[PDB]
């Protein structure tokens, strides 16, 4: 990949004094430079509500890293998450972000890494954070982040990757951008590291139907008094993560009745404190979702 | 501590079949049972805006752990943070929370642990999560969490403690409650693990003055056009974390002028892209804080 290295050397003259190692050369082919990206923000319609926040969170820290590294009150986010329903253009938006900020772009395909290296894959993940640190400003892009790193070997890679992710905290020039269609399926350990999340677009009635179906797939619903279609039709403006909060509020309403009757039995001397009794959290109803619809504004 | 163990055995009869180890017996003295706590919510005035959220986040998961462990849509928070200005009663509120929910209460004094054990302190921290798991429901209380675990030895304890903190995620019966007067000084790795944060009370004008003073202690302020007292007097309703967002917005306004003039110089061919020029992020002014005052509502 001597041809790839010669171009990045001419862009920043200080790069010719840098030496890669054996594992970093193999990943050098996976690097996309800003002049190779073909898409801009102009080619993407509907970014008007996001342009301002995208600059403050992504574009400015990459173009202007001296300010965030010199100012205590200014910090670049550890990771940025772009999410929306299927067909919102999350992958092209990340490429536009890379070109709009003049930063390099590396797209991790963990399956492509794992299938080629197996047990040696952690050295490829490690040599990729160092390579992104050398080719700064560099955007580490993780598409379909909900499935990123799913047995016991895949758990070793997670603990290693999170250590590397927290390592670039003191680094305004390296950014991790995640993209997903299933925000509710993102590992909680990832979401803790994505402080900035950008809603690309809203899900339609059919998409909100499927989101609620997956959210309630292991929850006991009422055989008579439950209506998925009515709930999905009256949740316009709800995102995937807003619908999860609606299901959380619905289950909370039933759990309140549960603990109210449980206290009534204990405070009336009916049952023991540790007594297992007839108390089972009741199946959810349509009213629990209709009566918790204002969770969207919280 | 055979006397302490006999009381906890009579409260829950299944506990007499449990065996502690050598390190867990030493911590058994540090356990406070609900009948030893003397304070309730009635003895604390001003909790009316917080009572509802305190139940959903702390009291209900501890009294009703079978529901959160049986319901996928219901999860107990990993950690809860109680914060407010000095004199808000954060420590007594955590004790009221423990008594109101009938859970055991262990107060970690890391200095008391470190001073007694030094290098063996990690085994005491480890034997304390297991002891809280056995004496469930148990509240792990961390007061003055901003100073919790601050050289290289104190970093080993952090990585160990965070591993234990993430270990009790699958545990509705063990909760970590942190308290602080300096929320802006909390380690970011802690804040990522405190999803629920309860504002006990608001800081007064004098307290908002000191908060802004510490926040801006390393930031270049204008010699003529800066007024701390005016900003502190007109930030009523701002918390400690809201004042940090105000300082973040102020520094953002100056950084916008910086990157605007930087682009003007590059787009006019005046300077090189990597040219170090006369561009220095300008000292903050009073107007940057007055013009970013609506960050409180975001």
User: Distance (Å) from the C-alpha of residue B106 to the closest C-alpha of chain A?
Assistant: 22
* CB hemisphere CA count around B206 (13 angstroms): 1
Asked whether A60 and A52 are in contact (CB, 8 A), the reply is no
Binding site feature residues of A for ATP: 84-91
- The contacts found for A122-128 with CB under 8 angstroms, 24 or more apart, are A122/A156, A122/A157, A122/A160, A123/A23, A124/A23, A124/A26, A124/A27, A125/A157, A125/A160, A125/A161, A125/A164, A126/A23, A126/A160, A126/A164, A127/A21, A127/A23, A127/A24, A127/A26, A127/A27, A128/A24, A128/A27
β-pairing, A174-180 with A79-83? parallel
Residue A6 to residue A212: CA distance in whole angstroms: 51
Instruction: Give the residue among B248, B249, B255 at the shortest CA–CA distance from B281.
Output: B255
CA distances from A107 to A97, A155, B277 (A): 13, 21, 34
Place of tokens 């055989």: A223
Residue A240 to residue A210: CA distance in whole angstroms: 10
Are residues A281 and B67, on separate chains, in Cβ contact within 8 Å?
A: yes
A contacts of B272 (beta carbons < 8 Å): none
Residue A79 to residue A57: CA distance in whole angstroms: 9
Q: How is A90-152 classified by DSSP, letter by letter?
A: HHHHHHHHHHHTT-EEEE--HHHHHHHHGGGHHHHHHHHHHHHHHT-SEEEEETTGGGTT--H
SS3 state of residue A177: strand
Asked whether A173 and A138 are in contact (CB, 8 A), the reply is yes
Please report the resolution in angstroms.
2.6
Extended beta strands in B77-221, E state: 79-83, 104-107, 138-142, 174-180, 196-199
Helix axes B152-167, B121-134, angle to 10 degrees: 20
Instruction: Give the strands of the sheet with A79-83, arranged side by side.
Output: A31-32, A104-107, A138-142, A174-180, A79-83, A196-199
Place of tokens 């950014």: A175
CB-nearest to A67 from B63, B215, B258 is B258
Residue A139's contacts (CB-CB under 8 Å, 6 or more residues apart) are: A62, A94, A97, A98, A101, A103, A104, A105, A106, A175, A176, A177
Q: Does B155 touch chain A (CB under 8 A)?
A: no
Q: Does B67 touch chain A (CB under 8 A)?
A: yes
Q: Helix/strand/coil (H, E, C) string of A199-222?
A: ECCCCCHHHHHHHHHHHCCCCCEC
Burial of A126 (0-12, 13-18, 19+ CB in 10 A): middle
Instruction: Give the strands of the sheet with B79-83, arranged side by side.
Output: B31-32, B104-107, B138-142, B174-180, B79-83, B196-199
Residue A178 to residue A192: CA distance in whole angstroms: 13
Q: Helix/strand/coil (H, E, C) string of B198-213?
A: EECCCCCHHHHHHHHH
Are residues A252 and B189, on separate chains, in Cβ contact within 8 Å?
A: no
DSSP for residue A174? E
Give the CA-trace dihedral at B66, B69, B71, B73, to 10 degrees: 130
Give the CA-trace dihedral at A43, A48, A53, A59, to 10 degrees: 30
Burial of A117 (0-12, 13-18, 19+ CB in 10 A): middle
| Structure-solving method | X-ray
Residue B113 to residue B123: CA distance in whole angstroms: 10
CB-nearest to A274 from B12, B188, B281 is B12
Asked whether B168 and B133 are in contact (CB, 8 A), the reply is yes
Are residues B74 and A192, on separate chains, in Cβ contact within 8 Å?
A: no
DSSP for residue A75? -
Instruction: Give the residue among B193, B212, B200 at the shortest CA–CA distance from B78.
Output: B193
Nearest 5°: CA angle at A114, between A113 and A116?
A: 70
**Greatest CA span in chain B, whole angstroms?**
82
Q: Does A193 touch chain B (CB under 8 A)?
A: yes
β-pairing, B174-180 with B138-142? parallel
DSSP for residue B265? H
Number of residues assigned to chain B: 298
Asked whether B289 and B250 are in contact (CB, 8 A), the reply is yes
Hey, how many other C-beta atoms are within 10 angstroms of the C-beta on B91?
Answer: 15
Burial of A195 (0-12, 13-18, 19+ CB in 10 A): middle
β-pairing, A31-32 with A104-107? antiparallel
A contacts of B213 (beta carbons < 8 Å): none
Burial of A268 (0-12, 13-18, 19+ CB in 10 A): exposed
**B46 annotated to bind ligand:** no
């Amino acid at each position: 990949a001597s041809l790839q290295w010669e171009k990045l050397v001419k862009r920043s003259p200080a790069l010719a004094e840098v030496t890669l190692d054996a594992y970093e050369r193999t990943i050098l082919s996976s690097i996309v430079t800003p002049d190779e990206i073909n898409i801009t923000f102009q080619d993407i319609g509907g970014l008007d509500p996001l342009i301002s926040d995208l600059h403050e969170s992504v574009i400015y820290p990459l173009m202007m890293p001296e300010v965030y590294s010199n100012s205590p009150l200014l910090q670049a986010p550890s990771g940025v998450l772009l999410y929306g329903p299927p067909g919102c253009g999350k992958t092209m938006l990340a490429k536009a972000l890379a070109k709009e900020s003049g930063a390099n772009f590396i797209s991790i395909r963990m399956s492509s890494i794992m299938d080629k290296w197996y047990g040696e894959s952690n050295k490829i993940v490690d040599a990729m954070f160092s390579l992104a640190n050398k080719l700064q400003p560099c955007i580490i892009f993780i598409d379909e982040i909900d499935s990123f790193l799913r047995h016991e070997v895949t758990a070793t890679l997670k603990a290693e990757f999170m250590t590397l992710w927290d390592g670039l905290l003191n680094n305004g020039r390296v950014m991790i951008i995640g993209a997903t269609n299933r925000i509710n399926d993102i590992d909680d350990a990832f979401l803790r590291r994505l402080p900035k999340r950008f809603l690309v677009s809203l899900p339609g009635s059919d998409q909100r139907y499927k989101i609620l179906s997956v959210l309630l797939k292991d929850t006991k619903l009422d055989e008579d008094e439950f209506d998925l279609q009515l709930i999905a039709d009256n949740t316009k403006g709800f995102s995937g993560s807003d619908l999860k909060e609606l299901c959380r509020e619905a289950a909370l309403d039933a759990a309140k009745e549960y603990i109210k009757q449980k206290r009534q039995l204990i405070d009336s001397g009916t049952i023991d404190v540790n007594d297992t009794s007839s108390l089972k959290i009741r199946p959810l109803k349509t009213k629990d979702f209709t009566s918790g619809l204002e969770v969207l504004f919280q």
